[PDB]
């Protein structure tokens, strides 16, 4: 476990709910790329890495192996489903708050299991869909996950934002508030 | 809350002393429980849970898989690391330092890569040992970080407080001072 | 090109 640099080639995921699947490659924690099983194309989260090529066909077949393997383990474990853990939610800015200058709001949702979540940005009872982006479910040492949701905005005196997190490991939805102060 | 059955495959690679120490560990998980794993140091699939045992016995039965998995240290870990040496291991982002105040004094070190950093608090050329509280290293996701180091103090006229920050991208530490 | 590692089937 003790090392200078660690990488996952790759982070394979498949779940009964949906059914959903995810294929990623991570280095030192951060995500290098994700393969879209729908459109059958590789999408890099870093521009310096775009230079290389990764054929999507591998992720497509590997996820089909995990489809059989998950179906095999349900019969073996006499139907034992995942335990819904408590997701930790925290909302903070990327850079120091400047009313004029632009900024990126970050809603970090940690300790996610199973990887099924609904992250929503709220501003004055209205939902925000413009200027939003989400990272894929990122792996953890405790075999749980963490997801990051971004929001590009220009701070204002009357503008206030909130992050609604919906999970099966919550009795009520979690909401974290933010103000430019 | 409906029933969810989750299966994960984490074909991980570990690295130390550059290219001198490489350890391949590929593990299969169900649900949040690691059932079976393959360490490069052992050279065979070894079950962690009773659920891992029927797969491990079957995969160790086939000699062809053993040779391909033993090759994965060079075929996966050692090969992909050479690509990292030119891209991710070349990425360097200089941090931005801002002190916000008073009884409390916080040093907001934002946007930097790699994760290695050493931030210190000084009270008039003298390093403060106690009364320092630091938040854990915050991963921003977009290959950038941030660390919030707070320092409790007492106010006096003519006393300057400095935030000393060390990072590989920086050739010399940043001299950001706050006058009182 | 980045070379990955595959998962084997369960019996």
């Amino acid at each position, epitope marked *: 476990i003790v090392a200078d640099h660690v990488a996952s080639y790759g982070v394979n995921l498949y779940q009964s709910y949906g059914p959903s699947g995810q294929y990623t490659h991570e280095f030192d924690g951060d995500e290098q790329f994700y393969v879209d099983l729908g459109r059958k194309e590789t999408v890099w989260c870093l521009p310096v890495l775009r230079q290389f090529r990764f054929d999507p066909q591998f992720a497509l077949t590997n996820i*089909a192996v995990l489809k059989h393997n998950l179906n095999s383990l349900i019969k073996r474990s006499n139907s034992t489903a995942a335990t819904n853990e408590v997701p930790e939610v925290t909302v903070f800015s990327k850079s120091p708050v400047t009313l004029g200058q632009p900024n990126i709001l970050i809603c970090l949702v940690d300790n996610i299991f199973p990887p099924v979540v609904n992250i929503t940005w709220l501003s004055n009872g209205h939902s925000v869909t413009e200027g939003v982006s989400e990272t894929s479910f990122l792996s953890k040492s405790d075999h749980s996950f963490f997801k990051i949701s971004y929001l590009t905005l220009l701070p204002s005196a009357e503008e206030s934002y909130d992050c609604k997190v919906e999970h099966w490991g919550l009795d009520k939805p979690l909401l974290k508030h933010w103000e430019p102060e | 809350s409906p029933e969810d059955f989750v299966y994960q495959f984490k074909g991980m690679c570990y690295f130390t002393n550059g290219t001198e120490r490489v350890r391949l560990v590929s593990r299969s998980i169900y649900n949040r429980e690691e059932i079976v794993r393959f360490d490069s140091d052992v050279g065979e699939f070894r079950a962690v849970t009773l659920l891992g045992l029927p797969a491990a016995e079957y995969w160790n039965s086939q000699k062809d898989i053993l040779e*391909r998995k033993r090759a994965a240290v060079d075929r996966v870990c050692r090969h992909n690391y050479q690509l990292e040496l030119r891209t991710t291991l070349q990425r360097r982002v200089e941090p931005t330092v801002t002190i916000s105040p008073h009884n409390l004094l916080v040093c907001s070190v934002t946007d930097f890569y790699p994760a290695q950093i050493k931030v210190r608090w000084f009270r008039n050329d003298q390093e403060e040992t106690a009364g320092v509280v630091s938040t854990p290293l915050i991963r921003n996701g977009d290959w950038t970080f941030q660390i919030l180091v707070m320092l409790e103090m007492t106010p006096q006229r003519g006393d300057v407080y400095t935030c000393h920050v060390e990072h590989p991208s920086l050739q010399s530490p940043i001299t950001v001072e706050w006058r009182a | 090109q980045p070379f990955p590692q*595959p998962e084997l089937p369960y019996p």
Partner: T-cell receptor
Amino acid sequence: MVVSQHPSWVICKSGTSVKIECRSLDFQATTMFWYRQFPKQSLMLMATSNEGSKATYEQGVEKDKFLINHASLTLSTLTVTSAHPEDSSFYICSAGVGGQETQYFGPGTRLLVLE
Amino acid sequence: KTTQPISMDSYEGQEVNITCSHNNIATNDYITWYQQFPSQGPRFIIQGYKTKVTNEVASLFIPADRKSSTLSLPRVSLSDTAVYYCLVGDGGSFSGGYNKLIFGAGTRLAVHP
């Protein structure tokens, strides 16, 4: 790892469609392939398939004539629509765990098309 | 892709060593061998990467430069009369990579009493 192929021997008229079945017997075929060998020549890959879909045919050979239905983790059948004396060849299928490196070949089907 | 002998004729209980020539081999490539009997599907004998492999059927030898490889059969029996195919590649897109396994001419071996 053992792979079977039915029928073993086949003889038909020109226009008749032939269903060559590829089955995995002591494992579950992740990837199933198809190969074509002529009188005194080497093996040539026709296509690659995965459950449920879909075929990844190679080159210079149409998919109108050759139909592959890899549904099931052990079954994959090849259909030769409107048979022609040119098609008279030896057909072998592969199965892996998966990929071409892990492949295990079937016994083979000898096709003979006549006027 | 690869070049191996056209044909070999040996006596019973003799060590047969077929040499495969692959100078243009890529770093992440496998050396795979198939035994085809007339007229049936080929049999997977041995496979390797950089190190020496040992099977109940045969043994694979790979030197440091990887420019060539040699398949050694212990005591050839009358039943070992077959076509031995040598193949280089990572298994193609489904494994995944550029180097897809393509069947060469193969060495026609014949064993005699």
